[PDB]
């Protein structure tokens, strides 16, 4: 929790890549794209 309140935030605000609004990794090439789609589709099923 101390790591998640001190180090983790500091890294997230320095060494994380900017994501464009709407991008949920559904356009990612290869397997990660399929998995991202499967999860987005499964999240919709779950919430319903």
């Amino acid at each position: 929790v101390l790591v998640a309140l001190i180090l983790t935030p500091a890294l997230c605000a320095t060494m994380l890549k900017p994501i464009a609004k709407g991008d949920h990794g559904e356009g990612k090439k290869g397997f990660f794209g399929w998995f991202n789609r499967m999860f987005e589709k499964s999240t919709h099923h779950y919430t319903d």
């Binding site: 790591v3 309140l5 890294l11 320095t14």
Partner: protein
């Protein structure tokens, strides 16, 4: 506290390295066993006639 260390990433890294250094040194001086001393202690009285 979170907002404090977002502006101060070096301070955040410093705390992490000191915690790791202390841990690395502790690994060298730490005893090694299968279990702790959990079994109940016993005292035997030996006599001969």
């Amino acid at each position: 506290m979170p907002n404090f260390f977002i502006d101060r990433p070096i301070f955040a890294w410093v705390i992490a390295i000191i915690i790791m250094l202390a841990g690395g040194l502790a690994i060298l001086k730490l005893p090694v066993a299968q279990y702790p001393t959990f079994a109940p202690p016993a005292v035997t009285i030996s006599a001969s006639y």
